Amino acid sequence: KAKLRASHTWNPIQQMSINVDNQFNYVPSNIGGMKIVYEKSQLAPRKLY
Amino acid sequence: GVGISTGTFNNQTEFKFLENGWVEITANSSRLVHLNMPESENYRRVVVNNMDKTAVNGNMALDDIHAQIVTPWSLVDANAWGVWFNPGDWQLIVNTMSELHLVSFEQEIFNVVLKTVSESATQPPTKVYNNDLTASLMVALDSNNTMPFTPAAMRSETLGFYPWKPTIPTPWRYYFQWDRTLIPSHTGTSGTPTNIYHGTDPDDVQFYTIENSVPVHLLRTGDEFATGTFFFDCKPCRLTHTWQTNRALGLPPFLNSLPQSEGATNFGDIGVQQDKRRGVTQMGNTNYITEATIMRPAEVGYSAPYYSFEASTQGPFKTPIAAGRGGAQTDENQAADGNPRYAFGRQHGQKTTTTGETPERFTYIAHQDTGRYPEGDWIQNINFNLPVTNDNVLLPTDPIGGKTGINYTNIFNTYGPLTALNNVPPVYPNGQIWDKEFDTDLKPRLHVNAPFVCQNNCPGQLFVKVAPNLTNEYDPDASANMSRIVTYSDFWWKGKLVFKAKLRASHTWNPIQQMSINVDNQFNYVPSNIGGMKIVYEKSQLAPRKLY
């Protein structure tokens, strides 16, 4: 069960995104080699107090 | 009343999730508008003739001759992305929604104030500001859309983009018919090409006044004004880009040989002679079936003449294109046609604290691959004998008209009954949101300036003006100029735009492209020690969508 996030700052947040450097970690090789690079999970900030 | 506020400030954008992944975005925007009395209290019919500049052969594109009506009214325009969303909100929309629907619009004027500048021409000449309690602000909402439509965003003249910075409306003016003739030439064109401003076709004449057409409201401090809610009529806006070219449609060729080893050079291979393959083509006289040759269902994108100026009744004008290029080949350096360029000020993105009057600018390179590399184009004689022979090919390299800097691609047009294209993507924050359709029998399939065109009905424009604050002396029959008390007004403007969006769903194994802050852009989203602010533009159809 998840809850959707809401923006609260003027500035954007840190999001996970594919890019020219990681791109090939998400698709097979000509050999069919596969890999599953690890990722981070609490990317956005929250105020503590 | 006098000591009573008539409104509330609200610049909060609410996101309210419904059922089945539909959100209802309601953008609240509030500003303090500052307004001065008019230069004059008259309608002026003015012509702009820069003949001198076009007088130089080879400078036709520098043409600015036009006629316009100058009015004593100001336009309150809030149709630009930056007025309603901040970098924060844009990230939310753009990274998580897949389509946008513009639903409605409302705006209201409150907490009106009128003051009069009194100068006590002293040693150090002084001036006292006093409240004119019985003075009036004049408001006119052209809801029947009588007046000619003038989107202030094509001039970077919208309300400003920051809720804690007061703003101002623009002086309203509109085009008045004129007739002008300009013959193109070039550097070293013997003579002086005709360059004539003929004047006005009487049957094309339309002088409009606000006073005669819209009901005018006088608001005093105690008053307030509110437009009601207007609903738009518009097809939804997609928040995704397409990437498939004619070259990537349908079933790829079956590879009879597959790489055995990993390696950037370990390719697979179709195993069949290009002249011995099965499949369909539209080259009735050839047995070659290649990826450039095999049949595709229609064509994605089209070729159009580039840096093409056309001419009608009023001077030359640039031929518009639905999409430019950029990617593998175009960056700022691989500069082309079709990509829009935005110039603007401190109120709309140029760094606040920056000194200097050069506009801030940017060329927008979308993400949908629907354009062209004219350099890769070629025409070739129907016999199709292959290593084609210099005179059975027309290359972007051979000159047309004997001009060495012109090739057939500049005059080329491949638009036709199989053309498939997409409407224009949103440009945050400088782009216009909605546009009025042309009241033309046949209409344009798109508008290159707004993703939303309202057909049957658009919100009308809002005009404002300080009413005349006369002095004791006033003689209407004097050929002079009416003397007025120096008055100005400050009022609060509150607008409300509602959207409907749908949430995106992952469909691939691999992640998507998302907007994110990072060590290189970070400082573009926070103030300076000086309080300098800036609003860097962003892209909007970041995620891919399959075309077919």
Place this chain on the structure above:
Amino acid sequence: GVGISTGTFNNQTEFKFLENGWVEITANSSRLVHLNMPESENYRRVVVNNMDKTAVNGNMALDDIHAQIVTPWSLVDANAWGVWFNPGDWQLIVNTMSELHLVSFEQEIFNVVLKTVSESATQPPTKVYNNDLTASLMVALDSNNTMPFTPAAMRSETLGFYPWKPTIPTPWRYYFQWDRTLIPSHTGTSGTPTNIYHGTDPDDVQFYTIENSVPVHLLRTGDEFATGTFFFDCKPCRLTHTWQTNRALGLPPFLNSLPQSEGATNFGDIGVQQDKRRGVTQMGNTNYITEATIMRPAEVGYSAPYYSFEASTQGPFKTPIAAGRGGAQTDENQAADGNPRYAFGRQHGQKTTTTGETPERFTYIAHQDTGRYPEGDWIQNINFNLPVTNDNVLLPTDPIGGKTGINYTNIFNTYGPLTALNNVPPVYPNGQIWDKEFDTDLKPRLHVNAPFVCQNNCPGQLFVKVAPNLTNEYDPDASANMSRIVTYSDFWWKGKLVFKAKLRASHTWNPIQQMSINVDNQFNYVPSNIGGMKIVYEKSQLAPRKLY
């Protein structure tokens, strides 16, 4: 309206006795708040770097480097005891109640006034004050507690403590993420320890604006504003102190010999050999049962590292402790860690008529005996051979790390599953009343700055600001600074705090410690011939309570 007051002054605290010894205290506080336009109308992102000061080896604790956002808004904070009760009321609570419950809070803004200073730069340059009748005060109540929580009491920046003295709000500012590295050193540390301000982690960035987050209210003279009633969620506060140490828990030893005569030296005597007594201990290898040795059920208080600075992502910080010491051994001279120190001004206790800018201060020595005399501590080898031998003991006297001014007590920690402690007592009048819990997975068992922490819900902060009073000249695209009419506002603030208390009952033969005026403190509760006022701090858990 213009000639109509919109509110009432009320600074009366009512005590309403219910049934079964429950009182319902309702504290009314009213002040006249004075407010000026902002330095700027912008949000500013500023860094504070006193590198120069830390540049001296041995001065790390003098670190002040931080980044913060400076906002054009002011904060109205009334969370300090002194805002709601006077010395008189405090005596009543503290001498006769045994527990306090914070129930609710309400505040409202009325009788708003805005004036504009006009200077008639004359010989003796003059200035006229005039009322700006249509001007507005801007009020924002962050009830969803969006903005970061900034209790003005940790800076002695609350409303003032006297109902007949006008006050002012504080400029609101909040911390902005930064990265800094500082290596400790000492007098004569060869070299220059790294002392670096690295900058901002982009993923830790959060720029907040009031305008984009809270609904803003414009109030003109005729207007008024009122927060509604907020109910807090908080465990009760005890008004009694405990005095029992591990040493005083349970059944004392039965004395086989009792004094026969009165006399400060006529002691009674256990009659049994310490190694021949019955009872329980946790010293499995010993037959000695003494009062230092016999088993107690848990431990009252704990030992924590002292004058311990810890370091994380943003610089060093002092390790906090739940209770200090004082009593038999500590007074001002027997100075220790854990006791809070308060510094403040004329608005919060420093004598009014006193000239000079040194803050007024005080170190609070509570009354609950739950702390430690580190000097009485000792570690001793498990063999327990008794007149312990210098190398089977670690005394607060032996040096650690070869430093002669450091002993194991400074790095010591005896907190564990048997620790029993009490929350912090109230500090009248400079102490904060309530505090916001940390939005952390695991929370702190207490807060050393307020006896009341509201968990699930706290009242939101109140922000105020003079709206921009522009002049005739205003150009939003100028890189200059907006020119405004010198405006200021005075408004009345009325707040209402309700408590629930329970009345105390005598349970001992002997009287209790009560707060009382006397020939030595008397003059601290009345004005000077000059009208000088002062507000000496007081203690709150005067009566004892049994722990077990």
